[PDB]
Design an enzyme around this catalytic site. Structure first.
Site, short mmCIF file in Angstrom:
data_model
loop_
_atom_site.label_atom_id
_atom_site.label_comp_id
_atom_site.label_asym_id
_atom_site.label_seq_id
_atom_site.Cartn_x
_atom_site.Cartn_y
_atom_site.Cartn_z
N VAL A 50 5.54 -6.38 14.34
CA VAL A 50 6.32 -7.58 14.63
C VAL A 50 7.69 -7.46 13.93
O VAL A 50 7.77 -6.90 12.84
CB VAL A 50 5.55 -8.85 14.15
CG1 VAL A 50 6.38 -10.12 14.29
CG2 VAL A 50 4.27 -9.02 14.94
N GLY A 51 8.75 -7.96 14.55
CA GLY A 51 10.08 -7.96 13.92
C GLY A 51 10.64 -6.57 13.64
O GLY A 51 10.46 -5.66 14.45
N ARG A 52 11.30 -6.41 12.50
CA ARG A 52 11.94 -5.14 12.12
C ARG A 52 10.95 -3.96 11.99
O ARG A 52 11.37 -2.80 11.95
CB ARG A 52 12.76 -5.31 10.84
CG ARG A 52 13.64 -6.54 10.81
CD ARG A 52 15.06 -6.28 10.27
NE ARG A 52 15.15 -6.24 8.80
CZ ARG A 52 15.61 -5.21 8.08
NH1 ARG A 52 16.05 -4.10 8.68
NH2 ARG A 52 15.66 -5.29 6.75
N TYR A 53 9.66 -4.26 11.91
CA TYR A 53 8.62 -3.22 11.74
C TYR A 53 8.51 -2.30 12.95
O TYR A 53 8.03 -1.17 12.83
CB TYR A 53 7.27 -3.87 11.48
CG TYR A 53 7.04 -4.32 10.06
CD1 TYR A 53 7.90 -5.25 9.45
CD2 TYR A 53 5.96 -3.85 9.32
CE1 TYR A 53 7.68 -5.68 8.15
CE2 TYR A 53 5.73 -4.28 8.02
CZ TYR A 53 6.60 -5.19 7.44
OH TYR A 53 6.37 -5.62 6.14
N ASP A 99 3.00 0.63 8.93
CA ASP A 99 3.75 1.37 7.90
C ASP A 99 2.95 2.52 7.24
O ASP A 99 2.99 2.70 6.01
CB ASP A 99 4.29 0.41 6.83
CG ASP A 99 3.20 -0.37 6.14
OD1 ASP A 99 2.28 -0.86 6.84
OD2 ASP A 99 3.25 -0.50 4.90
N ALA A 108 -5.74 3.80 -2.86
CA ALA A 108 -5.22 4.96 -3.61
C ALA A 108 -4.98 4.73 -5.10
O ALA A 108 -5.07 5.67 -5.91
CB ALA A 108 -3.95 5.46 -2.95
N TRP A 109 -4.65 3.50 -5.47
CA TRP A 109 -4.28 3.21 -6.84
C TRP A 109 -5.51 2.94 -7.72
O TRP A 109 -5.40 2.93 -8.95
CB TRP A 109 -3.30 2.03 -6.89
CG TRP A 109 -1.89 2.32 -6.39
CD1 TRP A 109 -1.43 2.19 -5.12
CD2 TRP A 109 -0.77 2.75 -7.19
NE1 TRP A 109 -0.09 2.52 -5.05
CE2 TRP A 109 0.34 2.87 -6.31
CE3 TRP A 109 -0.59 3.04 -8.55
CZ2 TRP A 109 1.62 3.27 -6.75
CZ3 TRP A 109 0.69 3.45 -8.99
CH2 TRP A 109 1.77 3.56 -8.09
N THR A 156 -7.72 -5.45 -8.68
CA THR A 156 -6.99 -6.66 -8.30
C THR A 156 -7.74 -7.52 -7.26
O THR A 156 -7.15 -7.95 -6.27
CB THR A 156 -5.60 -6.32 -7.74
OG1 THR A 156 -5.72 -5.25 -6.79
CG2 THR A 156 -4.67 -5.88 -8.86
N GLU A 200 -6.51 -8.19 2.36
CA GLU A 200 -7.15 -7.12 1.61
C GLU A 200 -8.14 -7.69 0.61
O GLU A 200 -9.19 -7.09 0.34
CB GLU A 200 -6.10 -6.29 0.89
CG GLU A 200 -6.64 -5.26 -0.10
CD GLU A 200 -5.56 -4.33 -0.57
OE1 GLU A 200 -5.09 -4.49 -1.72
OE2 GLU A 200 -5.16 -3.45 0.22
O1 LIG Z 1 7.16 -8.56 9.49
C1 LIG Z 1 6.06 -8.04 9.62
C2 LIG Z 1 5.11 -8.14 8.62
C3 LIG Z 1 3.87 -7.53 8.80
N1 LIG Z 1 3.59 -6.84 9.96
C4 LIG Z 1 2.27 -6.21 10.13
O2 LIG Z 1 1.43 -6.59 9.04
C5 LIG Z 1 0.97 -5.44 8.36
C6 LIG Z 1 0.74 -5.73 6.88
O3 LIG Z 1 2.00 -5.95 6.30
P1 LIG Z 1 2.56 -4.91 5.22
O4 LIG Z 1 2.47 -3.50 5.66
O5 LIG Z 1 3.94 -5.34 4.92
O6 LIG Z 1 1.52 -5.03 4.02
P2 LIG Z 1 1.75 -4.19 2.68
O7 LIG Z 1 1.49 -2.79 3.02
O8 LIG Z 1 3.16 -4.34 2.24
O9 LIG Z 1 0.82 -4.64 1.62
C7 LIG Z 1 2.05 -4.40 8.64
O10 LIG Z 1 1.60 -3.08 8.43
C8 LIG Z 1 2.37 -4.69 10.09
O11 LIG Z 1 1.41 -4.08 10.93
C9 LIG Z 1 4.55 -6.75 10.95
O12 LIG Z 1 4.32 -6.14 11.99
N2 LIG Z 1 5.78 -7.35 10.79
MN LIG Z 2 1.23 -1.78 4.92
#
Ligand SMILES: O=c1ccn([C@@H]2O[C@H](COP(=O)(O)OP(=O)(O)O)[C@@H](O)[C@H]2O)c(=O)[nH]1
Ligand SMILES: [Mn+2]
EC number: 2.4.1.87
Length: 277
Positions: free
Chosen positions: A55-58, A146, A167-168, A178, A236
């Site tokens: 979604v969005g810039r992703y 991502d 991984a952490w 956490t 998570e």
């Molecule tokens: O603006 C956004 C925010 C989130 N996502 C989706 O929501 C998932 C989880 O968000 P994010 O990867 O930012 O989680 P993080 O890895 O930072 O914990 C992303 O991988 C995307 O698939 C998206 O598409 N656009």
């Molecule tokens: Mn992610």
């Protein structure tokens, strides 16, 4: 009629944890036999799905790299369907897919907070599982956009319910994870308990099981919204609660989802997927 020993060799990796008390393999590089599995699953004509949201810039930042890499590393030698949930189809990158890869794209409403974007997935995936996915695939993985495939990510990862060692934390003590620790939250886990810390952006299982993972996770997400509360690490957090109660039949090593910022320890032998950098 597949046996564990037909494909799994835990002793190849003695420095790490290769099995759980409930008897689920933790799959580490050097432990699995992909050829035997490939032959067994091809005979059964299995099909593997993969949901990804952008979604969005992703979309411009992550989707091309996710899909391009998935095409070349994900369940090679097996029919794979990419399920692509986007808010804007007109910005969807256009990639050439190789043999046994196909896809279908869906329009989704873009949620306002990015926290909701990430958490809505649980609702959206379950609705798709009921509408079509249950008919289309034998197994299903759900992942963050991502991320990137670095090398082969194959049938060795398949099971009823599949979890990712985050991984952490794979080395850490359960009292340090956490987990959500506020009892007012559905995701709550008390100190003293917990097997592993799992990753939000990588899980899988049969359609049946993934519907259960998502339905329970979202039920707890909704309930938290009704107590003016929001779990620490969001979906998570609920996934970890869920996996504590309903143990996964398979766990993947951090090799299958590595963060390079941690560096590269002797344990991480061959990275299959990492976080986009
Ligand atoms: O603006 C956004 C925010 C989130 N996502 C989706 O929501 C998932 C989880 O968000 P994010 O990867 O930012 O989680 P993080 O890895 O930072 O914990 C992303 O991988 C995307 O698939 C998206 O598409 N656009
Ligand atoms: Mn992610």
């Amino acid at each position: 009629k597949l046996k564990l020993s037909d494909w799994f060799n835990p002793f190849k990796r003695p420095e790490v944890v290769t099995m759980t008390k409930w008897k689920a393999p933790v799959v580490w590089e050097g432990t699995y036999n992909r050829a035997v599995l490939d032959n067994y699953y091809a005979k059964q004509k299995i099909t593997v799905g993969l949901t990804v949201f952008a979604v969005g810039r992703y979309i411009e930042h992550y989707l091309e790299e996710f899909l391009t890499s998935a095409n070349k590393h994900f369940m090679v030698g097996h029919p794979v369907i990419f399920y692509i949930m986007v808010d804007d189809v007109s910005r969807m990158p256009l990639i050439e897919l190789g043999p046994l890869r196909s896809f279908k794209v869906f329009k989704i409403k873009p949620e306002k907070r990015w926290q909701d974007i990430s958490m809505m997935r649980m609702k959206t995936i379950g609705e798709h599982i009921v509408a079509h996915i249950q008919h289309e695939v034998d197994f299903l993985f759900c992942m963050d956009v991502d991320q990137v495939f670095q090398d082969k990510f194959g049938v060795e990862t398949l099971g009823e319910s599949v979890a990712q060692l985050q991984a952490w934390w794979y080395k850490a003590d359960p009292n340090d994870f956490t987990y959500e620790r506020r009892k007012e939250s559905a995701a709550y886990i008390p100190f003293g308990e917990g097997d592993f810390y799992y990753a939000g952006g990588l899980f899988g299982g049969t359609p049946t099981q993934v519907l259960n993972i998502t339905q329970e996770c979202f039920k707890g997400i909704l309930k938290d919204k009704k107590n003016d509360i929001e779990a620490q690490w969001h979906d998570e957090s609920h996934l970890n609660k869920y996996f504590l109660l309903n143990k996964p039949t398979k766990i993947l090593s951090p090799e299958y989802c590595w963060d390079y910022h941690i560096g590269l320890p002797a344990d991480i032998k061959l990275v299959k997927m990492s976080w986009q950098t």
